[PDB]
Coordinates of C-alpha atoms and ligand atoms in Angstrom, one line a residue:
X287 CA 30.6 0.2 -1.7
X288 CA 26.9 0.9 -0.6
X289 CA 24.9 -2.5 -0.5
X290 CA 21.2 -2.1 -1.0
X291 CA 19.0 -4.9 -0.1
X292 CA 16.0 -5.8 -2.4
X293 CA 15.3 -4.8 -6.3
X294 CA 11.8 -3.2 -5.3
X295 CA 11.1 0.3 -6.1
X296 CA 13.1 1.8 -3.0
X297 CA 15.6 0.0 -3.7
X298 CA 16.1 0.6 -7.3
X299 CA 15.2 4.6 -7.3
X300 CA 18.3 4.8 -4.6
X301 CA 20.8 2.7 -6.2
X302 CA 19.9 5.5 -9.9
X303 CA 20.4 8.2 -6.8
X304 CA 23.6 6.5 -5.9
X305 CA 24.8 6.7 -9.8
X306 CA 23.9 10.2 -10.2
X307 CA 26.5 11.1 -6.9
X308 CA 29.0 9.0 -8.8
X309 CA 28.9 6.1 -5.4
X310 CA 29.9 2.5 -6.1
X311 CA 26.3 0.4 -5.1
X312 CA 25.6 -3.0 -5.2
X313 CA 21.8 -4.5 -5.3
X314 CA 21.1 -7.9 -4.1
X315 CA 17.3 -9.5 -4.5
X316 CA 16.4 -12.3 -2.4
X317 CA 13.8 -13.5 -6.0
X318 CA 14.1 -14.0 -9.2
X319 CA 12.9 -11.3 -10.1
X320 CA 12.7 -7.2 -9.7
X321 CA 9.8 -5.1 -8.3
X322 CA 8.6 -6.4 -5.1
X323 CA 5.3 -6.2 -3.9
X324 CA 5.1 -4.9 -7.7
X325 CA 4.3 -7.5 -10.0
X326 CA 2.5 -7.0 -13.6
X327 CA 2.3 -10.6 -14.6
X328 CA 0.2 -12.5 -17.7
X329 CA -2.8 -14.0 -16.2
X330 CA -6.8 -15.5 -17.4
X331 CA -5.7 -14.0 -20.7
X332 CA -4.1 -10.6 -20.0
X333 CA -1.9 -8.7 -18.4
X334 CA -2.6 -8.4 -14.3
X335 CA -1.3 -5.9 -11.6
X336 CA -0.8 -9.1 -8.6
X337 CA 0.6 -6.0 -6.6
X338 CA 0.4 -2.6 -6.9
X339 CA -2.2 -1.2 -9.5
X340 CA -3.2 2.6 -9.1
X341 CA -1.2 6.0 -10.2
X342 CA -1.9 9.6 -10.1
X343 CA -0.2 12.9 -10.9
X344 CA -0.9 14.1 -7.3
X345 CA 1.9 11.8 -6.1
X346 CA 5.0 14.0 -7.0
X347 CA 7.7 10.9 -6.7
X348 CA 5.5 7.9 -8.8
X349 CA 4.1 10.8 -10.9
X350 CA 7.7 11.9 -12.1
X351 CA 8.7 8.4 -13.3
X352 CA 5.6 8.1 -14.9
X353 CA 6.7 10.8 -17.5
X354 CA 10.2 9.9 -17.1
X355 CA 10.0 6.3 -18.4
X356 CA 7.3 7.6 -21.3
X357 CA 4.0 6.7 -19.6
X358 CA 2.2 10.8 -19.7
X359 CA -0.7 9.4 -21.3
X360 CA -0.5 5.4 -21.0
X361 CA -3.1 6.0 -18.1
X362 CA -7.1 4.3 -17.8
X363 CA -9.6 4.8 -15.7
X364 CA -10.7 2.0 -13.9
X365 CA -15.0 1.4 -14.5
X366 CA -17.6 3.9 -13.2
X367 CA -20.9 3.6 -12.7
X368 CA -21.4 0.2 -11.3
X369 CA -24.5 -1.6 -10.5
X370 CA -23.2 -1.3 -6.3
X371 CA -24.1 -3.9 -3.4
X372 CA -23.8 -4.0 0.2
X373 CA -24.1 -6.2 3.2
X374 CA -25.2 -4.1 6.2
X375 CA -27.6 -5.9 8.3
X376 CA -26.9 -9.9 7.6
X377 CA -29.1 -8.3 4.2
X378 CA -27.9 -6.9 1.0
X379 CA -28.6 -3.8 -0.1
X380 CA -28.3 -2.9 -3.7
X381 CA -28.1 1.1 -5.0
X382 CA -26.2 2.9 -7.8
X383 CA -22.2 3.7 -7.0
X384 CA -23.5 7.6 -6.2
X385 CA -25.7 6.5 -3.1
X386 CA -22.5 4.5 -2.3
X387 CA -20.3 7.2 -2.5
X388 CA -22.3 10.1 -0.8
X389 CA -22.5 8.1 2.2
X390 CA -19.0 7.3 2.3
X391 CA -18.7 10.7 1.2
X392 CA -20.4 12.1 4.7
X393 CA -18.4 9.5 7.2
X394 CA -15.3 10.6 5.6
X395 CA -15.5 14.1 5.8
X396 CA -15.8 13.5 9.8
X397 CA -13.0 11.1 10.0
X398 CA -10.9 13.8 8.7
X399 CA -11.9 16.2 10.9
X400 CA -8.4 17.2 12.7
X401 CA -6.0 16.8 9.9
X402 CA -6.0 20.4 9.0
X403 CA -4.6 21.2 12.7
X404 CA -2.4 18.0 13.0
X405 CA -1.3 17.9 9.3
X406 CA -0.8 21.8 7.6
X407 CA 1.7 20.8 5.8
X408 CA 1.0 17.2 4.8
X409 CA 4.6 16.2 4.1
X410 CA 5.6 17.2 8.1
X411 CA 3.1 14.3 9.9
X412 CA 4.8 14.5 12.9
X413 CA 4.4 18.6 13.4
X414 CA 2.4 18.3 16.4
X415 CA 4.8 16.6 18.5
X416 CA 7.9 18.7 17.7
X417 CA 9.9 21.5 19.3
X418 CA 8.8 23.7 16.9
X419 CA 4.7 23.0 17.4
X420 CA 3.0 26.3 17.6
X421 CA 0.0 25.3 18.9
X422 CA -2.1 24.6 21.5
X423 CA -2.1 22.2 24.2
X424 CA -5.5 19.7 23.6
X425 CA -4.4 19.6 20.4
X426 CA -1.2 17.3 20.8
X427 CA -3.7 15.3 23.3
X428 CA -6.3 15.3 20.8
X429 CA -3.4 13.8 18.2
X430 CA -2.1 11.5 20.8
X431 CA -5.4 10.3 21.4
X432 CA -6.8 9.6 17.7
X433 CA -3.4 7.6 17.5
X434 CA -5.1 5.0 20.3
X435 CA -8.2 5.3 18.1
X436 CA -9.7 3.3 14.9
X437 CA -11.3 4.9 12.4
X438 CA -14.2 2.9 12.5
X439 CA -15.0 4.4 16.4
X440 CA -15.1 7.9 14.9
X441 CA -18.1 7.4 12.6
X442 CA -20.0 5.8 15.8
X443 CA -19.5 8.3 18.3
X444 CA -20.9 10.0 15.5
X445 CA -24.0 8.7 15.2
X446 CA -24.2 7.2 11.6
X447 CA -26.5 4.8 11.1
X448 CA -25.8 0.6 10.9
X449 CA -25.4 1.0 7.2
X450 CA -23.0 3.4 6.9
X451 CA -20.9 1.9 9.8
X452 CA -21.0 -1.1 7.8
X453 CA -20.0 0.7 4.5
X454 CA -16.4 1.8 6.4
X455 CA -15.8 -1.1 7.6
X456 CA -16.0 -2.8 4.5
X457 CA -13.7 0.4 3.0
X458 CA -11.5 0.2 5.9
X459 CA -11.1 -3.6 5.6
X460 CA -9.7 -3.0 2.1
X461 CA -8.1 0.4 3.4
X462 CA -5.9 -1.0 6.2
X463 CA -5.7 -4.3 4.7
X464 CA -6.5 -6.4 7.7
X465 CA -8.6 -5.7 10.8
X466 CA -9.7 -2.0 10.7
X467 CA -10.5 -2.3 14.6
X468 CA -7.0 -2.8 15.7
X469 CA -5.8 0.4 12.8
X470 CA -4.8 4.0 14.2
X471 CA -7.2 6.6 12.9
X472 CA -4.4 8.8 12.4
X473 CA -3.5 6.9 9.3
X474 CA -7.0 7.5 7.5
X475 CA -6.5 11.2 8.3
X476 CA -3.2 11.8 7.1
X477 CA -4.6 10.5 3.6
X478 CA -7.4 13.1 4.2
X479 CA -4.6 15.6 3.9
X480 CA -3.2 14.5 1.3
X481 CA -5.8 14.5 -0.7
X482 CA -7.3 18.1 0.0
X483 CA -9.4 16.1 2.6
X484 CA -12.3 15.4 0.0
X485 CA -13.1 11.6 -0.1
X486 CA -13.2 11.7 -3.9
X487 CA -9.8 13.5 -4.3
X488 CA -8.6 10.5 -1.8
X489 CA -10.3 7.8 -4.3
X490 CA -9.1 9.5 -7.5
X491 CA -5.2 9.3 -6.0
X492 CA -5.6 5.7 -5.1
X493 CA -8.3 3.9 -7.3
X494 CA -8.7 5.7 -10.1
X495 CA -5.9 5.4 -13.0
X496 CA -4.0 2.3 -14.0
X497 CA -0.8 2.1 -16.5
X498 CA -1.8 0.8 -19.5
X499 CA 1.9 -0.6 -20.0
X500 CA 2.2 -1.8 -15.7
X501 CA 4.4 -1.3 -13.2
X502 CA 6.7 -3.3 -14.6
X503 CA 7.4 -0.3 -17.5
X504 CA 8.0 2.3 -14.3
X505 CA 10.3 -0.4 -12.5
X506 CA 11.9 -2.3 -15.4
X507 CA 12.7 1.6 -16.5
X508 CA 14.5 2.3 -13.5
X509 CA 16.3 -0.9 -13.5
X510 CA 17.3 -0.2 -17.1
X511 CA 19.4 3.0 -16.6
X512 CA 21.7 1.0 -13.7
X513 CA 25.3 0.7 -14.8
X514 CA 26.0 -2.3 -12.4
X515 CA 24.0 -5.7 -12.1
X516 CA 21.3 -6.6 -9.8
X517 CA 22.3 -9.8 -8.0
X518 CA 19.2 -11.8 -8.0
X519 CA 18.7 -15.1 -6.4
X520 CA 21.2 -13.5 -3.2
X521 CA 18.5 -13.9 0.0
X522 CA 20.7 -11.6 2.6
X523 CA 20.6 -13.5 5.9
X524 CA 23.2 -10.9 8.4
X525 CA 24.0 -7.5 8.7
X526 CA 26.5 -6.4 10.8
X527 CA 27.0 -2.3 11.6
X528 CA 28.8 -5.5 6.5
X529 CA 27.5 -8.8 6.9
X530 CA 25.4 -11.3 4.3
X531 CA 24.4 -14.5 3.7
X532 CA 24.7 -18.5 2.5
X533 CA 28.4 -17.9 3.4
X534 CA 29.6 -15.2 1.3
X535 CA 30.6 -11.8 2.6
X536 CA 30.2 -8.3 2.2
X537 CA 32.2 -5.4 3.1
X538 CA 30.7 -2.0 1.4
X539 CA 30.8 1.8 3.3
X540 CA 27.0 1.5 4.2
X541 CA 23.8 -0.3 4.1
X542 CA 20.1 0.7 2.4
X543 CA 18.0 -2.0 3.9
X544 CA 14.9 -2.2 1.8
X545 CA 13.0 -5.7 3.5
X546 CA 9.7 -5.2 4.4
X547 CA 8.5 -5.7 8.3
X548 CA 6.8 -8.4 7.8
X549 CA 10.6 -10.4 6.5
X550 CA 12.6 -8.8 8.9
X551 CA 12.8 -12.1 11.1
X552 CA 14.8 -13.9 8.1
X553 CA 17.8 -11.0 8.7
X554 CA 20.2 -11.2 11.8
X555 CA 21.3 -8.0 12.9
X556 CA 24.3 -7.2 15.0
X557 CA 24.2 -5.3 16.9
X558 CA 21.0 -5.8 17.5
X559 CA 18.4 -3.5 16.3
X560 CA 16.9 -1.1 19.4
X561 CA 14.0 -2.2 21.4
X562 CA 11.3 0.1 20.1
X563 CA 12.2 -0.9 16.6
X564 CA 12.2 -4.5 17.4
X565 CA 9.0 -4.3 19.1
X566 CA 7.6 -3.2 15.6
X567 CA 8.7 -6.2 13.9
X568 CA 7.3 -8.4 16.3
X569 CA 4.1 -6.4 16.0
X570 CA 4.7 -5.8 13.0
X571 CA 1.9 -3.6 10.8
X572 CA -1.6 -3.8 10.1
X573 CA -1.7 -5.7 6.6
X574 CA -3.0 -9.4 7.1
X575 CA -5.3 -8.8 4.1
X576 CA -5.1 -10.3 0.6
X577 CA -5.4 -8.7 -2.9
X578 CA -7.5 -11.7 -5.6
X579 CA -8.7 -11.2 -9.3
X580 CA -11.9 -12.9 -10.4
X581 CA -13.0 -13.8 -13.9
X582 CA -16.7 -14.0 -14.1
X583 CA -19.0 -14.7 -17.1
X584 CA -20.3 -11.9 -19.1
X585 CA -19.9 -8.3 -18.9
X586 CA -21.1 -6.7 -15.6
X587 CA -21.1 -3.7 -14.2
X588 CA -20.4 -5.0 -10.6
X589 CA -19.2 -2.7 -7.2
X590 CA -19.2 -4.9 -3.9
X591 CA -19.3 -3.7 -0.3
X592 CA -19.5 -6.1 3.1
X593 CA -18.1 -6.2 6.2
X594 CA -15.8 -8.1 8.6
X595 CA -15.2 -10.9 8.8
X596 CA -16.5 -11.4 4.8
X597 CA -13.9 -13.2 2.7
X598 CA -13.3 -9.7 0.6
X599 CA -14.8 -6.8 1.6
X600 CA -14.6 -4.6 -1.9
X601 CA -14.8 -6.2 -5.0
X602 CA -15.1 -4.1 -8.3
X603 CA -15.3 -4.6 -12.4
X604 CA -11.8 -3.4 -14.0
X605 CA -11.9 -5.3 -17.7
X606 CA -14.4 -6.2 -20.1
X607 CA -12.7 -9.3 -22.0
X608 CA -13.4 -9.9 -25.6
X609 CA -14.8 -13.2 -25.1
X610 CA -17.2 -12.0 -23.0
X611 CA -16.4 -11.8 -19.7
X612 CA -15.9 -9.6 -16.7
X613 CA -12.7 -9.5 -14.6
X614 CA -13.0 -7.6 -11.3
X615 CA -10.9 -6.9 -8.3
X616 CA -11.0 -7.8 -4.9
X617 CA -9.6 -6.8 -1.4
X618 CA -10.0 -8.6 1.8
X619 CA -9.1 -8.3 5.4
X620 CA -7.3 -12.1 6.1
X621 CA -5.8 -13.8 4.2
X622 CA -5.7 -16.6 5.9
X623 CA -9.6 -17.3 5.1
X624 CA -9.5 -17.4 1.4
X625 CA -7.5 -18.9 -1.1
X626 CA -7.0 -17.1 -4.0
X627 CA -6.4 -19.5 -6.6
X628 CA -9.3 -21.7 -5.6
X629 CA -12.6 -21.4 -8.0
X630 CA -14.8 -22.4 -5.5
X631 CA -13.6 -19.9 -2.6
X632 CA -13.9 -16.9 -5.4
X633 CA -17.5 -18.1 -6.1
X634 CA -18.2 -17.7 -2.0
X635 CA -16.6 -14.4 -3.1
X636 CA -19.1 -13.3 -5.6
X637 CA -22.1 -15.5 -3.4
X638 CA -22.0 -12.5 -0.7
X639 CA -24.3 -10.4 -3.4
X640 CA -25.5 -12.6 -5.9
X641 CA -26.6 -15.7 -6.8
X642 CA -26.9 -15.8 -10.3
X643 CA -23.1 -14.6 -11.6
X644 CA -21.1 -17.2 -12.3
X645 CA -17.3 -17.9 -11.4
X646 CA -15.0 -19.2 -14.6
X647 CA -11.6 -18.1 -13.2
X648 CA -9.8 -16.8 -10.5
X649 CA -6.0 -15.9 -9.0
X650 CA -3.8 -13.9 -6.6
X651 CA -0.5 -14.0 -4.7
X652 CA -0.9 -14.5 -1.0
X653 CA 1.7 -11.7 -0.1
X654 CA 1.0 -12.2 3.6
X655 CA 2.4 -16.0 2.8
X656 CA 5.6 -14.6 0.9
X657 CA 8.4 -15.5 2.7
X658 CA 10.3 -12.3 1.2
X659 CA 7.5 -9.5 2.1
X660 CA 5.1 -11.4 5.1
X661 CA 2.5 -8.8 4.8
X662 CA 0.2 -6.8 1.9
X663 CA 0.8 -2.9 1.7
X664 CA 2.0 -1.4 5.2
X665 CA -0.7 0.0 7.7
X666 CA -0.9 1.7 10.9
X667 CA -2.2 -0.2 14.2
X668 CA -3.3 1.6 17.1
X669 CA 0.2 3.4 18.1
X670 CA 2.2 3.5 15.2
X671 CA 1.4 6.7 13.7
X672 CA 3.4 8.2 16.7
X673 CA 6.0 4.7 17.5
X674 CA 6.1 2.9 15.0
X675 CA 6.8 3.7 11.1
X676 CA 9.2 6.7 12.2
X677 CA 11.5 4.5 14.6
X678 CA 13.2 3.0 11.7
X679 CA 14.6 6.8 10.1
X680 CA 20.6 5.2 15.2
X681 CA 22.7 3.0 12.6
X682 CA 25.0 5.5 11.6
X683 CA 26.0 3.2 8.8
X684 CA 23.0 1.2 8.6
X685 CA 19.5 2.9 7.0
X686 CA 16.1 1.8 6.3
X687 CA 14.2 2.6 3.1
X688 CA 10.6 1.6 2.2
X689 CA 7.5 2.7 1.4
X690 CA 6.4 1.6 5.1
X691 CA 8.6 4.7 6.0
X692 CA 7.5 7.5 4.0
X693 CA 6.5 10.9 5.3
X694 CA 3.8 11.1 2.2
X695 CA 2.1 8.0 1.1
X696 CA 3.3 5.8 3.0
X697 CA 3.1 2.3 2.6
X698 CA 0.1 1.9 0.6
X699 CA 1.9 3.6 -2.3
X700 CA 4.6 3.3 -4.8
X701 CA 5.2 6.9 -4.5
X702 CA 6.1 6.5 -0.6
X703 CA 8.9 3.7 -2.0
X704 CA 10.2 6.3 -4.5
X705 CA 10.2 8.8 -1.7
X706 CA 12.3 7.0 0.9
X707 CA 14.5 5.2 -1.5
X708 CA 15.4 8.6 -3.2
X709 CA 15.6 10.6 0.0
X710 CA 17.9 7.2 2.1
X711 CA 20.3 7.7 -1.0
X712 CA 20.7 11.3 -0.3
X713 CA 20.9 11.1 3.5
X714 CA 24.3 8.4 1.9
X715 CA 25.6 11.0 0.2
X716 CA 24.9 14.2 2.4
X717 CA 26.6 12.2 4.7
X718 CA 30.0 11.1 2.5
X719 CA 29.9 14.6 1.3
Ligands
FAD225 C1 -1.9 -6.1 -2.8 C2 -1.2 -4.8 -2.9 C3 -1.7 -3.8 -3.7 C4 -1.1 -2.6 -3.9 N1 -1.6 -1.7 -4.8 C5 -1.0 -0.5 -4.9 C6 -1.6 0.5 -5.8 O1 -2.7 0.3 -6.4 N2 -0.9 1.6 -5.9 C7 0.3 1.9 -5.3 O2 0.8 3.0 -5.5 N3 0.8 1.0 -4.4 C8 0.2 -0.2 -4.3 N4 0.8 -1.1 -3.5 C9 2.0 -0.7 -2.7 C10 3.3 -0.8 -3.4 O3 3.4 -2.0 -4.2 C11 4.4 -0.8 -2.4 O4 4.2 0.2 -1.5 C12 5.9 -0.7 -2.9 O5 5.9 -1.6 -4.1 C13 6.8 -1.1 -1.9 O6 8.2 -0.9 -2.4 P1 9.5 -1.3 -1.5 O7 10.7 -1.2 -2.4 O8 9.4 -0.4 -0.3 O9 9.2 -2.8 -1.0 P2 9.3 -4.2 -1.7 O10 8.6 -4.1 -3.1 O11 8.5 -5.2 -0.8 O12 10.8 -4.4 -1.9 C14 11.6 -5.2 -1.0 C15 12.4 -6.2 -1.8 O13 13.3 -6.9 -1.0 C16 13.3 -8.3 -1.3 N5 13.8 -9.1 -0.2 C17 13.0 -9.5 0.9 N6 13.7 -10.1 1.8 C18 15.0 -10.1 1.3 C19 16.2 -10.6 1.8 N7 16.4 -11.3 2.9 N8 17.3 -10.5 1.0 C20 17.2 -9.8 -0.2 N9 16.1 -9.3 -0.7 C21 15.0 -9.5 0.1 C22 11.9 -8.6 -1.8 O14 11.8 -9.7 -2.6 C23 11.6 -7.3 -2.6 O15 12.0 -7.4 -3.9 C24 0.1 -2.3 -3.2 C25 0.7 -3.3 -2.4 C26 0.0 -4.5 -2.2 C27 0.7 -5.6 -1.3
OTS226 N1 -4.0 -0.3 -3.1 C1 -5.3 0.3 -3.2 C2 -5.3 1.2 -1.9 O1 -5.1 2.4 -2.6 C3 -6.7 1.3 -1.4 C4 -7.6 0.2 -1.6 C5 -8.9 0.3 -1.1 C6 -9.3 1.4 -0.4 O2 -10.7 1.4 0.0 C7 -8.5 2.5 -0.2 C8 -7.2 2.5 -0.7

């Protein structure tokens, strides 16, 4: 009687919240398969996270599954102490992971500096601009302001050097996933606040710790306590506020629309959705970036910075293979400039810093391309902190759940997905109660 669109982690940790209540749900999945933009799949020998990656006990909602499902201490660190490269001046600088790190360090702890006005309580980001904000005047211009603001622009006015406005771009090309320029600032310091505004407590929570077991042991968990099948292979095309697709029809009390932004366009809604909200799809977010694994021959202790427009802007070492070689990571800005799959294109990768390392393997998902997601992990342009993400929380008996709508992590984290999915279901049952 409530149909919830998509078997990714919203979707699935509101249909368990549905079950608790006792509510009749029903899960349709446009794939043929469960988790989303999570995805631990078999590849170059080993078990690979194409989607999301990184876990910490800081993030109340992912950390709970985590010991729910068994996973308290299936938990790795990924590699420290890396040989580190950078591209700052056309010219390529190369220092330990520490010199990196203290000058991201410094640039952070001024791009954070008005979250502890904006952001007391970290969970509330939209404080400043309610009836019950307390406080003074320049500060709601001063947050209206940053919003129109990227967080590259702080670090200039400043006055870091060249290289360490090229360090944040390159971190803010992986950061926002796509063009830091056009990104609000206001995104980069919520996560500030969040993570006791230290940049290392902010790397710990988002780069840090991987599950040994994968995602798929947090998401193929939830799945496995539903009482009721998920319908995969069931692409929804209408919604009606119940509406459907390749001819069948659904009635149901209410709907928990899980699609990201970026596949909104394949779903007709009537009535139509408001301006404001539409105006988001067609701007959609930030993330035009793109996420690649590279295998390279022997073991390296490898940590790679450069700026736009490179073809990935951080690339790290995250296994040491028995048969000596290295896999590392990747993020990148555009997706549309690299093709993941293609060994030569990961050997331009690797060509930004070195010369003498030597490409063997390579592969990603374009996410961007993906007909059912049409972007990476959902960012903040210039705006968006303020109209954008918080436009979608209207449709009495229509709701929207994602991690692109979190008050916490949102978007660029699993535990933003558990949030909203968990806290959609309840506004369902509030509601019917
Ligand atoms: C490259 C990348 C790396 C990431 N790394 C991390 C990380 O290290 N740590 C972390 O915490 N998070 C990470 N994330 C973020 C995390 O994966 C997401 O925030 C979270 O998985 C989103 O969950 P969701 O349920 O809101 O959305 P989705 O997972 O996108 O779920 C939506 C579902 O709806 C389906 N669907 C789409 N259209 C239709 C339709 N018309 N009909 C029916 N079903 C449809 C989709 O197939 C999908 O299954 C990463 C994301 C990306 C892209
Ligand atoms: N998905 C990884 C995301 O946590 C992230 C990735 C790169 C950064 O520089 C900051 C955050």
């Amino acid at each position: 009687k409530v149909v919830i669109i998509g078997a990714g982690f919203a979707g699935l940790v509101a249909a368990r919240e549905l079950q608790t209540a006792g509510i009749e749900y029903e899960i349709l999945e446009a794939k043929d398969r469960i988790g989303g933009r999570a995805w631990t799949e078999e590849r170059m020998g080993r078990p690979l996270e194409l989607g999301a990656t990184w876990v910490h006990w800081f993030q109340a909602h992912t950390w709970t599954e985590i010991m729910r499902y068994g996973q308290r201490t299936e938990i790795t660190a990924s590699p420290s102490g890396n040989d580190a490269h950078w591209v700052t001046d056309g010219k390529v600088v190369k220092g330990t992971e520490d010199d990196l790190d203290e000058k991201l360090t410094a640039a952070m702890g001024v791009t954070y500096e008005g979250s502890e006005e904006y952001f007391p309580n970290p969970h509330d980001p939209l404080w400043v601009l309610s009836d019950d904000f307390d406080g003074p005047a320049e500060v709601r211009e001063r947050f209206l302001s940053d919003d129109q603001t990227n967080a590259i622009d702080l670090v200039k006015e400043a006055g870091f050097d060249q290289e360490t406005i090229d360090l944040v771009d390159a971190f803010w090309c992986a950061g926002y996933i796509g063009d830091p320029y056009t990104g609000s600032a206001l995104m980069a310091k919520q996560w500030g606040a969040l993570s006791d505004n230290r940049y290392r407590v902010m790397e710990d929570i988002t780069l840090k710790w991987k599950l040994n077991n994968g995602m798929r042991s947090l998401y193929d968990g939830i799945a496995g306590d539903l009482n009721t099948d998920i319908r995969l292979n069931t692409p929804v095309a209408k919604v009606e506020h119940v509406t459907t697709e390749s001819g069948e029809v659904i009635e149901a009390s209410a709907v928990i629309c899980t699609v990201p932004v970026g596949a909104l366009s394949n779903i007709e809604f009537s009535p139509a959705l408001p301006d404001a909200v539409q105006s988001v799809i067609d701007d959609k977010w930030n993330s035009q970036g793109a996420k690649i694994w590279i295998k390279i021959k022997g073991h390296h202790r490898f940590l790679g910075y450069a700026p736009k427009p490179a073809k990935m802007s951080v690339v790290r070492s995250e296994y040491f293979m028995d048969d000596d070689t290295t896999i590392l990571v990747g993020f990148g800005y555009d997706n549309t400039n690299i093709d993941l799959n293609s060994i030569e294109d990961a050997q331009a990768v690797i060509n930004q810093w070195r010369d003498d390392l030597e490409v063997v393997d390579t592969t990603g998902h374009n996410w961007v391309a993906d007909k059912w997601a049409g972007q990476a992990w959902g960012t903040l342009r210039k705006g968006q902190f303020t109209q954008g993400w918080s436009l979608f929380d209207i449709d009495s008996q229509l709701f929207f759940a994602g991690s692109d709508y979190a008050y916490g992590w949102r978007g660029v984290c699993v535990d933003g997905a558990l949030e909203k999915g968990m806290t959609t279901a309840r506004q369902v049952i509030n509601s019917m109660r």
